[PDB]
Design a protein around this nucleic acid. Structure first.
Ligand SMILES: [Mg+2]
Ligand SMILES: [Mg+2]
Ligand SMILES: [Mg+2]
Ligand SMILES: [Mg+2]
Ligand SMILES: [Mg+2]
Ligand SMILES: [Mg+2]
Ligand SMILES: [Mg+2]
Ligand SMILES: [Mg+2]
Ligand SMILES: [Mg+2]
Ligand SMILES: [Mg+2]
Ligand SMILES: [Mg+2]
Ligand SMILES: [Mg+2]
Ligand SMILES: [Mg+2]
Ligand SMILES: [Mg+2]
Ligand SMILES: [Mg+2]
Ligand SMILES: [Mg+2]
Ligand SMILES: [Mg+2]
Ligand SMILES: [Mg+2]
Ligand SMILES: [Mg+2]
Ligand SMILES: [Mg+2]
Ligand SMILES: [Mg+2]
Ligand SMILES: [Mg+2]
Ligand SMILES: [Mg+2]
Ligand SMILES: [Mg+2]
Ligand SMILES: [Mg+2]
Ligand SMILES: [Mg+2]
Ligand SMILES: [Mg+2]
Ligand SMILES: [Mg+2]
Ligand SMILES: [Mg+2]
Ligand SMILES: [Mg+2]
Ligand SMILES: [Mg+2]
Ligand SMILES: [Mg+2]
Ligand SMILES: [Mg+2]
Ligand SMILES: [Mg+2]
Ligand SMILES: [Mg+2]
Ligand SMILES: [Mg+2]
Ligand SMILES: [Mg+2]
Ligand SMILES: [Mg+2]
Ligand SMILES: [Mg+2]
Ligand SMILES: [Mg+2]
Ligand SMILES: [Mg+2]
Ligand SMILES: [Mg+2]
Ligand SMILES: [Mg+2]
Ligand SMILES: [Mg+2]
Lengths: 141, 149, 129
RNA sequence: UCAAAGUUUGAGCUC
RNA sequence: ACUAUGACUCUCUUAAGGUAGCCAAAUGCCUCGUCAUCUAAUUAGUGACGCGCAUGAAUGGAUGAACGAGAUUCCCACUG
RNA sequence: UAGUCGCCGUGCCUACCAUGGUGACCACGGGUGACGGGGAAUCAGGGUUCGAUUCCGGAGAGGGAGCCUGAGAAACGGCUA
RNA sequence: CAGCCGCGGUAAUUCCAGCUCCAAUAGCGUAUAUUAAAGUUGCUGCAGUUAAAAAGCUCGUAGUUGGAUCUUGGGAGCGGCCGUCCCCUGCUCGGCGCCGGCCCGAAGCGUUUACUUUGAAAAAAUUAGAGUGUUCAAAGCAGGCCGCCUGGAUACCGCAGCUAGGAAUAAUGGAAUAGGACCGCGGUUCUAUUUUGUUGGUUUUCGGAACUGAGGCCAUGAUUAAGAGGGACGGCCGGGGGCAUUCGUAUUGCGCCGCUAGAGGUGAAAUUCUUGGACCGGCGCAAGACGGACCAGAGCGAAAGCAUUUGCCAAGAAUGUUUUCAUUAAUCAAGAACGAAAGUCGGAGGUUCGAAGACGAUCAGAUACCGUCGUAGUUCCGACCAUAAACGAUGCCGACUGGCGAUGCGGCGGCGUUAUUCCCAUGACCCGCCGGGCAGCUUCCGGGAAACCAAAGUCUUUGGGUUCCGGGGGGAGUAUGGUUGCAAAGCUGAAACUUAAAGGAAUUGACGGAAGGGCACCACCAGGA
RNA sequence: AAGACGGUCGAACUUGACUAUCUAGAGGAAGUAAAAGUCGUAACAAGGUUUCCGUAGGUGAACCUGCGGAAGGAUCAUUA
């Protein structure tokens, strides 16, 4: 503070109330455009259909072909590049199957090589992708 | 520092500690008042009075030699002006400014000084309104002002 | 304009004590200041000051010793409940053993420990240690 | 007692 | 460094070689140009596109409120 | 001001007069992913966010409206649109 | 794989396996909202010369803050010079009762807030918390002795409201044309009511409201005049402002006279002017710019800025002052005045230069740098405009803490020189002191990331007052909206998306078509195959 | 009782105005992210015409010139 007056409570509080908005994160929390724009709409997971398999190329120093997958959500209809992680797990993901998608730990921010891919697959057809990779369970056919 | 200027001059009178009268001075308060009456009748301010007294009669301050002050004595005898002399001198100054501008419309500096002068006037005017010497309806109005000196 | 007489004086003395100056002249004499000095003096932190009476706001000459680390002020004058006295004296002082917070009260000008004895809250003026 | 002077494998430098 | 195109360069011809802006308009043959809207349905009409047979700068170009016994298109109410 | 209604006080309603009231001390208007509170989480001291939710108060039973019956209802596990 | 840095290009401590080893253990992992960590929203507690940052300047009502000054002390007894217990209102009915008076008790009245302390009052549940062997505990409020014995408490519980104590700090009134207090005197008008043994009525006496005459007494009534401020006065001071007036050369142009063939211009040339007389020189005339040199690390102005002579108009900082008033003051959203150049609209004027434009030159290209021309503009008056690195890139007031010399103004003092000449009192020198002023130097004052600063100091020993304004880079001062302007454009002012870095000071290199030094026939110089 | 005149409340439908919120939309025009193109080389060393600021006009692009500022410049000094 600078006005250390005994009766400037109002003037102070007002000033604070104006400047909280210049903080980028508060504005992020309280204006709705971010929450609405986010397809997750303040959610951890979201279900969606696989419609095509895509090999997105990595950024520099690194060099790799990341295996992503174009899902279309049911509730909104928005389109997402959900990335499948680990080794040999893509042969499992068949086309036209429901997968539960989650975030990527960054709250609206791209991560490393995969440019603009904030989402990863957890399940396939009520079957944990982990269980398929480990070999505990099998795909129902 | 000064109000409408950057100067910060430290020059004024400095009265000494002894409030006592000197030994050589033997002119009474009554005689001084009879002089006051003549000078006020002839037409003169408390300032110019105080000046003459200190210069010729060698009596620096009446407040110190006698008990009460010069203006309150004049107020007792009904010589006080309708409004205070400083406002009198300001409006007279104001008028001369607006007069010189009347021919000389360009003098922008004169306009700036005029405006500051009027601000200073209304400041004094609110002090005197609180001191209950002017009526609530008093108002400097360049239209009516020139009637007042 | 000059608002706080005390606020100017106490800075002047702290800028003397940092330089180890021996005696200090302060230009406006206030009654509250005078009470303040007498409080520190009875408790032995400084010697015998003397005040120069002009039919005016007086002056004051303090013969300074060397035991005073700081003598500070709190503007604005905050009210202080007995609840807050501990948090004030905690956050405002070097330790729990020494140092003082002097607050004038209805009762009178006195230390905070004397306020604790007398059961008397009040308006914080300042502090020293 | 003032005209100008451009570039350099993709094929691997470094605590 | 996809094709296309051609920022860039040269040359032939003339004294240069259509800059800014605009359109299938009262100016476009092929032509009902193509796409969208307006209709149940529209060779008309309106808004973008331009390769402009043959746009174009006081032979003036573009806009633009008010006015018109001016030219077309649609809508309301209304009617032998 | 005088009445009406109403169990009384009051633009509650009616009639006749007067022309007032609020506003940078943020009204007015718009938003609120707001029923409120008692409380919870977090913490050095200051504070920050949450609190539909077993206790209290409010409102509501498809949408709005209207009413009989009753000490008590503008009731919805009572009626009429 | 890896939240991030990074790993993987043939001995991979980073992948897939095996072999081991670590953390936690009936639990652990992942995601999202959210909280401490965050002195990265800061009241306690941030920044604002250079890393992001102070409105171009000043005026201005609300807002916020405001100098000093009025009660200090006193009596009796007490403890180890000192401390503490006891006390520091005033103005109809009965007893500590005592010989009508005195005191006390009671009723009513008290110039007023903030501030502080008490109590009551607060729904429980919850929290903390006393007790209590659920076999411990989580829980519960129960239980225990062999008929009896006990518990079933307590605290916190904002803010506002009430209740009685305290009166330092901050307001606030009061007696100043005295229609001023006390306590008294007498009228005018109106009546509470008591009264004359008993039937009826009134005024008085005696009490209670308004009005009205003249007293006695009151120490009779007015805080000081701020190193707060305004206003006055004296002679000065200053490129301070405006208007009008005067002068100078040079300039380019013209007219005339003189000799004459080139003149121009460049690194080198041409278009250009020129035997219809150029350039050069002389004398006259002409119009508009500009007032050099004197001109300083000088002055004044709110700021841009302000310099030919003379005249008129008014102002002001600063100084001396035993001049008047006595708080009249500081900073400020809203609102307002001024505000270089370019730009714009009308006239007036159109000398020079010169955006645009053309051509001539170099050049791989140059629609530029060079040249010859040359338009708007550049000048004045009248209308708009409000933007610059408008930089000290440093908001305003106020205080304090080191020197040193120089300087500008006003003022003061002091041998002597030197003009007035013939002294005084002035002028020029000379040596000092004082106020504030533009700057300078200086140091282990201390601060600061450092560069640096007697301020960018008086900061974890953090609060003198008050405005404005910044919170990762970009996207973007864009969009959309609003407002102003003839237009140009100004002002207010978002988001999506992307991205892990962007910057400052200073060190060592390397480079330099920057300078200073020094050397070498694989450099030059002088030359040779 | 059936029933009717009238008052009051008034659901409901029809229309308009303002107002909030979401949203399709031919074609156009920006920003950002990968690249080992094409044209040049402004800037950082006087970057080979010092750099930058405000404002006007111009040009394929980076840029050029005019007028007046600033030094964050290649000068803290240049001599009665
Ligand atoms: Mg001011
Ligand atoms: Mg060159
Ligand atoms: Mg190469
Ligand atoms: Mg068409
Ligand atoms: Mg054309
Ligand atoms: Mg024609
Ligand atoms: Mg033609
Ligand atoms: Mg034609
Ligand atoms: Mg049209
Ligand atoms: Mg509670
Ligand atoms: Mg309830
Ligand atoms: Mg309630
Ligand atoms: Mg209900
Ligand atoms: Mg119902
Ligand atoms: Mg049922
Ligand atoms: Mg029910
Ligand atoms: Mg391994
Ligand atoms: Mg913390
Ligand atoms: Mg936080
Ligand atoms: Mg910078
Ligand atoms: Mg900066
Ligand atoms: Mg400024
Ligand atoms: Mg600035
Ligand atoms: Mg004070
Ligand atoms: Mg001249
Ligand atoms: Mg300037
Ligand atoms: Mg403002
Ligand atoms: Mg101008
Ligand atoms: Mg101009
Ligand atoms: Mg014009
Ligand atoms: Mg030229
Ligand atoms: Mg050419
Ligand atoms: Mg040229
Ligand atoms: Mg600027
Ligand atoms: Mg600080
Ligand atoms: Mg940013
Ligand atoms: Mg990156
Ligand atoms: Mg060699
Ligand atoms: Mg040699
Ligand atoms: Mg260049
Ligand atoms: Mg050069
Ligand atoms: Mg350059
Ligand atoms: Mg540079
Ligand atoms: Mg050109």
């Amino acid at each position: 503070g600078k006005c250390r007056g005994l009766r400037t409570a109002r003037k102070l509080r007002s000033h604070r109330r104006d400047q909280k908005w210049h903080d980028k994160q508060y504005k992020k929390a309280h204006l709705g455009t971010a929450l609405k724009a986010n397809p997750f709409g303040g959610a951890s997971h979201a279900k969606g259909i696989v419609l095509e398999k895509v090999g997105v190329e990595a950024k520099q120093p690194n060099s790799a072909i990341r295996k992503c997958v174009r899902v279309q959500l049911i509730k909104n209809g928005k389109k997402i590049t959900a990335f499948v992680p680990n080794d040999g797990c893509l042969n499992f993901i068949e086309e036209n199957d429901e997968v539960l998608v989650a975030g990527f730990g960054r709250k609206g921010h791209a991560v490393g090589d995969i440019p603009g891919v904030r989402f990863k697959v957890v399940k396939v057809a009520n079957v944990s992708l982990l269980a398929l990779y480990k070999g505990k369970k099998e795909r129902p056919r | 520092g000064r109000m409408h200027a950057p100067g910060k001059g430290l020059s004024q009178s400095a009265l000494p500690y002894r409030r006592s009268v000197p030994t050589w001075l033997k002119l009474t308060s009554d005689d001084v008042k009879e002089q006051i009456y003549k000078l006020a009748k002839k037409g003169l301010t408390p300032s110019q009075i105080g000046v003459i007294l200190r210069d010729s009669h060698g009596v620096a301050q009446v407040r110190f030699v006698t008990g009460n002050k010069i203006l309150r004595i004049l107020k007792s005898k009904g010589l006080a002006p309708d409004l205070p002399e400083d406002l009198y001198h300001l409006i007279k100054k104001a008028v001369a400014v607006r007069k010189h501008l009347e021919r000389n419309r360009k003098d922008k500096d004169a306009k700036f000084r005029l405006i500051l002068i009027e601000s200073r006037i209304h400041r004094l005017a609110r002090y005197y309104k609180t001191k209950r010497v002017l009526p609530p309806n008093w108002k400097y109005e360049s239209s009516t002002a020139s009637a007042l000196v | 304009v000059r608002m706080n007489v005390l606020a100017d004086a106490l800075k002047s003395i702290n800028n003397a004590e940092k330089r180890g100056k021996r005696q200090v002249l302060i230009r406006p004499c206030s009654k509250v200041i005078v009470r303040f000095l007498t409080v520190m003096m009875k408790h032995g932190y400084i010697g015998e000051f003397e005040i120069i009476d002009d039919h005016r706001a007086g002056k004051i000459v303090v013969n300074l010793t060397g035991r005073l680390n700081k003598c500070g002020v709190i503007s604005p004058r905050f009210d202080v409940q007995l609840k807050d006295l501990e948090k004030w004296q905690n956050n405002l002082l070097p330790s729990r053993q020494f140092g003082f917070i002097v607050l004038t009260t209805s009762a009178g000008i006195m230390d905070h420990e004397e306020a604790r004895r007398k059961h008397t809250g009040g308006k914080i003026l300042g502090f020293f240690f």
